[PDB]
Amino acid sequence: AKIIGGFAVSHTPTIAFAHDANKYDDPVWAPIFQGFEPVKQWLAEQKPDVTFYVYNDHMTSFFEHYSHFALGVGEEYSPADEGGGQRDLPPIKGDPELAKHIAECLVADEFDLAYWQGMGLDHGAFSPLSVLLPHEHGWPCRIVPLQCGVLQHPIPKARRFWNFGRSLRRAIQSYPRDIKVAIAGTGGLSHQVHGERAGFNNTEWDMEFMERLANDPESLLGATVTDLAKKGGWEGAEVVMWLLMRGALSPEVKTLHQSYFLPSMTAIATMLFEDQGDAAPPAESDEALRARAKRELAGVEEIEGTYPFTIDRAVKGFRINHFLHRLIEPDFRKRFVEDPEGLFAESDLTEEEKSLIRNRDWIGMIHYGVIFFMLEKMAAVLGIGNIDVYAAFRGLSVPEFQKTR
Amino acid sequence: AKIIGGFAVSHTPTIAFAHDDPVWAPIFQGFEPVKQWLAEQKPDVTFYVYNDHMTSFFEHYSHFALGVGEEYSPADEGGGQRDLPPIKGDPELAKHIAECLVADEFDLAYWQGMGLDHGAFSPLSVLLPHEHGWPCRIVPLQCGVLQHPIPKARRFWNFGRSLRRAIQSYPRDIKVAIAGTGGLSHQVHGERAGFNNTEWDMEFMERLANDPESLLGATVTDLAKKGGWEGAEVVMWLLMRGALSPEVKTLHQSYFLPSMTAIATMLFEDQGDAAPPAESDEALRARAKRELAGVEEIEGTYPFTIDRAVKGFRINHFLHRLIEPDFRKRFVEDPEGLFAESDLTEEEKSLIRNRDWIGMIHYGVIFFMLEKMAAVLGIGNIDVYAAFRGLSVPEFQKTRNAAITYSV
Numbered sequence: 105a106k107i108i109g110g111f112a113v114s115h116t117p118t119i120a121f122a123h124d125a126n127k128y129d130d131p132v133w134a135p136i137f138q139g140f141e142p143v144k145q146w147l148a149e150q151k152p153d154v155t156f157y158v159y160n161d162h163m164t165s166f167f168e169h170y171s172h173f174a175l176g177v178g179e180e181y182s183p184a185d186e187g188g189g190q191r192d193l194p195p196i197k198g199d200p201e202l203a204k205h206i207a208e209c210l211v212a213d214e215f216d217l218a219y220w221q222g223m224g225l226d227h228g229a230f231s232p233l234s235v236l237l238p239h240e241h242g243w244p245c246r247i248v249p250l251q252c253g254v255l256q257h258p259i260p261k262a263r264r265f266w267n268f269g270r271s272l273r274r275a276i277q278s279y280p281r282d283i284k285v286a287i288a289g290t291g292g293l294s295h296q297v298h299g300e301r302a303g304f305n306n307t308e309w310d311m312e313f314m315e316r317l318a319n320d321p322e323s324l325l326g327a328t329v330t331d332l333a334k335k336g337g338w339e340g341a342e343v344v345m346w347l348l349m350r351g352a353l354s355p356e357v358k359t360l361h362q363s364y365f366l367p368s369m370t371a372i373a374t375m376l377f378e379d380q381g382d383a384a385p386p387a388e389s390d391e392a393l394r395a396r397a398k399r400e401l402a403g404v405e406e407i408e409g410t411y412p413f414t415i416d417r418a419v420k421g422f423r424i425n426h427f428l429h430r431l432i433e434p435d436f437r438k439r440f441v442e443d444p445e446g447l448f449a450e451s452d453l454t455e456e457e458k459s460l461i462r463n464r465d466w467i468g469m470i471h472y473g474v475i476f477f478m479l480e481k482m483a484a485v486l487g488i489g490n491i492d493v494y495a496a497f498r499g500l501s502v503p504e505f506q507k508t509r
Numbered sequence: 510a511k512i513i514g515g516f517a518v519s520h521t522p523t524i525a526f527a528h529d530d531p532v533w534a535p536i537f538q539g540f541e542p543v544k545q546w547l548a549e550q551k552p553d554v555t556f557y558v559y560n561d562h563m564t565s566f567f568e569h570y571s572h573f574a575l576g577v578g579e580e581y582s583p584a585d586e587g588g589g590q591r592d593l594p595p596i597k598g599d600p601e602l603a604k605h606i607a608e609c610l611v612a613d614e615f616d617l618a619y620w621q622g623m624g625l626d627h628g629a630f631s632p633l634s635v636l637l638p639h640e641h642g643w644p645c646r647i648v649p650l651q652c653g654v655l656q657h658p659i660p661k662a663r664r665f666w667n668f669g670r671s672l673r674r675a676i677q678s679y680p681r682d683i684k685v686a687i688a689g690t691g692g693l694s695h696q697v698h699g700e701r702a703g704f705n706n707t708e709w710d711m712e713f714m715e716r717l718a719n720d721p722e723s724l725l726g727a728t729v730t731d732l733a734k735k736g737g738w739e740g741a742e743v744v745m746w747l748l749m750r751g752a753l754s755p756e757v758k759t760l761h762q763s764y765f766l767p768s769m770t771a772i773a774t775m776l777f778e779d780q781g782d783a784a785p786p787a788e789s790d791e792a793l794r795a796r797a798k799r800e801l802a803g804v805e806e807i808e809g810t811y812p813f814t815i816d817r818a819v820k821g822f823r824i825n826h827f828l829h830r831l832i833e834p835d836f837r838k839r840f841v842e843d844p845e846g847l848f849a850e851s852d853l854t855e856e857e858k859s860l861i862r863n864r865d866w867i868g869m870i871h872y873g874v875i876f877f878m879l880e881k882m883a884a885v886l887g888i889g890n891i892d893v894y895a896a897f898r899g900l901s902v903p904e905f906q907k908t909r910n911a912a913i914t915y916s917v
């Protein structure tokens with residue numbers, strides 16, 4: 105319900121790399137870490153419950169299937185593998201509920217989304233988070249990551265990123281729970297990391313862009329990919345993600361911090377923004393918005409034997425649904441059938457989930473949070489046939505059931 | 510550039526977990542008029558709207574996943590790859606369609622190289638003769654109807670609406686059909702399993718064809734009650750009807766409800782809009798190229814557009830697996846034996862073997878696959894950059910303020 109402010113920070117793997125190598129003593133790296141100090145401490149004082157974390161993934165967890173606004177709805181996130189194995193970092197926790205409320209308001213506001221769980225976070229996330237948050241135990245806050253498809257064009261327009269941030273504020277503000285939320289926009293600034301133009305930077309544009317983002321962000325919304333990549337490098341045009349975070353903050357903000365360093369490929373920059381509230385009650389109240397967000401599923405309760413696959417349900421059901429989804433892999437059913445206890449013992453299903461499968465408990469799995477298309481798969485591995493699954497859903501048997509056609 | 514009209518049709522899997530009888534004969538006969546309209550109207554491409562039933566799309570799940578790839582095999586749904594010939598996609602039409610949609614502020618997804626399930630392959634193995642291949646090419650719009658929140662019906666409608674002028678603006682006069690394939694009324698889960706409603710089914714089909722804007726207020730609830738929970742996927746039908754003329758001509762319609770799912774079918778013929786469109790289909794083309802216009806004036810830069818993703822897909826996908834520890838293990842130890850099993854052409858293999866960094870960028874490898882390949886190999890990002898710049902590492906490091914090295 106309460107947005108405290110937002111920070112902007114580069115997401116270069118060099119940040120992760122210099123940290124892991126512990127070069128806080130290093131001539132080059134030392135003043136750069138001192139550049140993160142105001143954000144690190146602010147985050148340690150204000151103590152947000154969740155960081156809504158805008159970043160892009162770097163063809164690691166997103167490639168064969170690649171989406172624009174992909175909202176992490178999962179209960180927890182782990183460092184991804186990038187060819188050198190996962191970093192020595194603990195899993196950071198999610199916020200399925202807050203993710204769920206944001207999901208609902210954004211669809212109401214006509215943004216087409218995508219939801220995902222289980223998949224690691226690469227340097228886009230864990231490079232700066234590793235340096236902004238302490239973690240030799242567990243992370244101090246939760247996260248609702250929002251991974252943006254900025255690498256495969258055509259991608260959303262600059263104004264579309266901004267407008268996303270605009271709805272994002274109203275959703276987060278209308279969350280009827282008493283929490284501090286910060287908003288992160290990661291990536292940039294100037295850099296190009298491919299082709300003969302690799303090496304490119306533009307300190308002047310970087311400074312002009314940061315000042316405009318802070319004090320006149322609407323002046324950037326006419327920016328094309330061509331503009332942003334001419335002035336900032338091809339991969340520097342990922343700064344549209346900074347427009348998104350900026351769009352989620354009060355129209356005016358108190359720019360508490362700005363730092364800039366350009367050791368190597370990437371202009372490593374950092375902004376801290378203090379939210380200045382609402383100098384005017386919203387055009388649509390918090391109450392009205394919660395209405396309109398629930399509207400499409402208003403009533404749905406009053407329909408028996410109906411267990412909609414909402415996001416809470418999907419998160420609840422993710423381990424069982426993922427395991428049953430593995431049936432489409434040929435080798436999987438060559439241990440789901442020959443040796444179902446071995447697959448079980450080597451899996452991470454709670455024992456309750458194993459007994460549900462074991463008993464073929466069809467409507468019991470629908471009750472638990474198994475989607476039927478994961479059962480459709482199950483009934484065509486060991487047995488079984490749809491008429492069976494449909495009958496057990498009403499406790500009937502095949503003959504009595506078949507009497508409707 | 511010409512929409513010949515399109516059809517709406519059910520996509521139940523029993524039309525293939527069976528099919529390939531006297532109960533069936535009048536059901537198939539519901540499909541064969543459209544079938545002959547598809548061998549007589551001769552479509553070059555079929556923009557085919559459907560939904561994956563949690564085969565291909567799951568752990569990561571999208572609302573409008575445009576298929577951009579050059580070829581689709583049928584998805585394994587738990588019971589093996591169903592013996593069908595790989596159907597052809599149309600990347601260049603997908604690319605152009607994506608460009609207009611983004612300009613109209615629709616957030617998309619793009620995918621390649623994953624199976625199509627019964628949601629596509631099944632009802633098409635009825636409308637399309639498929640001896641050793643298929644009549645046309647397909648642009649698969651996988652929709653995300655299985656996990657709420659999902660886009661409002663008015664949003665599915667506008668998509669199809671924008672999708673219309675986007676296909677009309679394709680500069681190539683070929684023949685395009687459209688196929689919103691869903692439903693009809695049913696419910697395949699819960700104590701409510703087996704529900705139907707032939708008195709909404711008929712009201713719905715008639716309104717969709719003759720007063721479809723009278724469905725833009727349907728909530729999920731209104732739709733789920735009046736037709737089942739899974740039935741409410743007909744919101745896809747509104748997309749297809751969205752992409753047709755306001756006034757159409759319901760050429761044909763069938764309806765047979767054997768078991769669980771109400772099997773419907775609608776044949777529309779496109780007429781032609783009321784006067785010209787408000788945006789000329791050349792000015793549209795301009796607006797759809799706006800974001801990347803003049804990008805060719807940027808030197809040493811190779812944008813990663815759809816055409817490049819399609820062109821780079823094999824070598825990009827192959828390199829992407831360096832994140833898999835057991836793959837990259839081999840890649841260091843047994844490169845050629847890995848190369849053999851892979852589907853990489855000889856040049857792709859050579860590019861990798863010769864560590865031709867500049868070559869891979871030009872060819873279509875996105876940089877972030879080389880960042881991994883560098884890491885896997887023990888060298889770092891810098892060596893790649895220097896190589897891009899035709900400079901030695903020290904000579905390139907000179908161009909930087911400080912000299913740092915890094916990986917992973």
Ligand SMILES: O=C(O)c1cc(O)c(O)c(O)c1
Nearest residue numbers: 115116117118297369370890
């Ligand atoms: O080499 C870099 O500075 C660099 C490498 C990356 O993969 C990246 O995403 C980035 O923002 C910067």
Ligand SMILES: [Fe+3]
Nearest residue numbers: 160228291342
């Ligand atoms: Fe990035």
Ligand SMILES: [Fe+3]
Nearest residue numbers: 560691692742
């Ligand atoms: Fe369906």
